[PDB]
Enzyme design. Structure first.
Site, PDB file in Angstrom:
ATOM      1  N   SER A  73      33.951  29.736  47.474  1.00 35.06           N
ATOM      2  CA  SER A  73      34.188  30.114  46.085  1.00 35.06           C
ATOM      3  C   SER A  73      35.633  30.607  45.974  1.00 35.06           C
ATOM      4  O   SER A  73      36.295  30.824  46.988  1.00 35.06           O
ATOM      5  CB  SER A  73      33.178  31.196  45.636  1.00 35.06           C
ATOM      6  OG  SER A  73      33.407  32.449  46.266  1.00 35.06           O
ATOM      7  N   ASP A 121      38.318  33.359  43.607  1.00 29.89           N
ATOM      8  CA  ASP A 121      38.453  34.452  42.637  1.00 29.89           C
ATOM      9  C   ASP A 121      39.687  34.132  41.798  1.00 29.89           C
ATOM     10  O   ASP A 121      40.763  33.897  42.355  1.00 29.89           O
ATOM     11  CB  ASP A 121      38.673  35.779  43.360  1.00 29.89           C
ATOM     12  CG  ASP A 121      37.552  36.114  44.310  1.00 29.89           C
ATOM     13  OD1 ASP A 121      36.378  35.917  43.933  1.00 29.89           O
ATOM     14  OD2 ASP A 121      37.845  36.577  45.428  1.00 29.89           O
ATOM     15  N   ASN A 168      37.614  32.101  49.120  1.00 25.45           N
ATOM     16  CA  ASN A 168      36.658  32.715  50.039  1.00 25.45           C
ATOM     17  C   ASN A 168      36.072  31.574  50.877  1.00 25.45           C
ATOM     18  O   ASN A 168      35.094  30.933  50.486  1.00 25.45           O
ATOM     19  CB  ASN A 168      35.558  33.429  49.248  1.00 25.45           C
ATOM     20  CG  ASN A 168      36.119  34.467  48.267  1.00 25.45           C
ATOM     21  OD1 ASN A 168      36.691  35.480  48.676  1.00 25.45           O
ATOM     22  ND2 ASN A 168      35.984  34.199  46.969  1.00 25.45           N
ATOM     23  N   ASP A 216      32.123  31.251  51.670  1.00 29.75           N
ATOM     24  CA  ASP A 216      31.136  30.657  50.774  1.00 29.75           C
ATOM     25  C   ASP A 216      31.691  29.609  49.832  1.00 29.75           C
ATOM     26  O   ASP A 216      31.022  29.196  48.897  1.00 29.75           O
ATOM     27  CB  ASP A 216      30.352  31.732  50.006  1.00 29.75           C
ATOM     28  CG  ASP A 216      31.099  32.280  48.796  1.00 29.75           C
ATOM     29  OD1 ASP A 216      32.335  32.434  48.855  1.00 29.75           O
ATOM     30  OD2 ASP A 216      30.427  32.558  47.776  1.00 29.75           O
ATOM     31  N   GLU A 232      42.571  44.634  41.899  1.00 35.47           N
ATOM     32  CA  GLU A 232      42.123  43.260  42.078  1.00 35.47           C
ATOM     33  C   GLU A 232      43.273  42.263  42.225  1.00 35.47           C
ATOM     34  O   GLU A 232      43.240  41.390  43.100  1.00 35.47           O
ATOM     35  CB  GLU A 232      41.238  42.795  40.916  1.00 35.47           C
ATOM     36  CG  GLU A 232      39.810  43.323  40.885  1.00 35.47           C
ATOM     37  CD  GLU A 232      38.956  42.886  42.074  1.00 35.47           C
ATOM     38  OE1 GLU A 232      39.390  42.014  42.865  1.00 35.47           O
ATOM     39  OE2 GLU A 232      37.839  43.439  42.211  1.00 35.47           O
ATOM     40  N   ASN A 243      34.990  35.639  40.170  1.00 35.24           N
ATOM     41  CA  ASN A 243      34.480  34.608  41.082  1.00 35.24           C
ATOM     42  C   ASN A 243      33.836  33.356  40.464  1.00 35.24           C
ATOM     43  O   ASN A 243      33.010  33.437  39.542  1.00 35.24           O
ATOM     44  CB  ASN A 243      33.525  35.263  42.088  1.00 35.24           C
ATOM     45  CG  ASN A 243      33.146  34.333  43.214  1.00 35.24           C
ATOM     46  OD1 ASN A 243      32.055  33.772  43.222  1.00 35.24           O
ATOM     47  ND2 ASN A 243      34.064  34.138  44.150  1.00 35.24           N
TER      48      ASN A 243
END
Length: 130
Positions: free
Chosen positions: A51, A53, A46, A49, A35, A60
């Site tokens: 958002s 992380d 992102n 959308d 990750e 998220n």
């Protein structure tokens, strides 16, 4: 902070992650490795959308932490996403535990299905004393 393999394994063990909801330490290590490369400051926006992380587990903002800028987002871990950017991973661990308490378990992270599921993850904890 970017953890070294074994120091992270013990850090996670002290925090109660070994076998949490049936998830081995090797699985958590494989998750953090893929990750963020063990980087607590890792971030990924992102654009699709709106958002983001955050941290070592790339949690998220849409569902787990509040950053104030993700539309219709919720905050299931009840934490500022900033808490997921600390060198101290206690809050990130508390949130990761919150994620896995849901139906999917460790499967919540697609990267875990892609690079850890049905894989030999032994190498992640070998020689760490855990």
């Amino acid at each position: 902070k970017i953890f070294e393999r074994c120091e992270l394994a013990r850090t996670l063990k002290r925090l109660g992650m070994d076998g949490y909801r049936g998830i081995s330490l090797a699985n958590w290590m494989c998750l953090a490795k893929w990750e963020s490369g063990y980087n607590t400051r890792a971030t990924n926006y992102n654009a699709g959308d709106r958002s983001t992380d955050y941290g070592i587990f790339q949690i998220n903002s849409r569902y787990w932490c509040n950053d104030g800028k993700t539309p219709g987002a919720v905050n299931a871990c009840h934490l500022s996403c900033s808490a997921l950017l600390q060198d101290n991973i206690a809050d990130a661990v508390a949130c990761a535990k919150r994620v896995v308490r849901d139906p999917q378990g460790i499967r919540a992270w697609v990267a875990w299905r892609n690079r850890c599921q049905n894989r030999d993850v032994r190498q992640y904890v070998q020689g760490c004393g855990v």
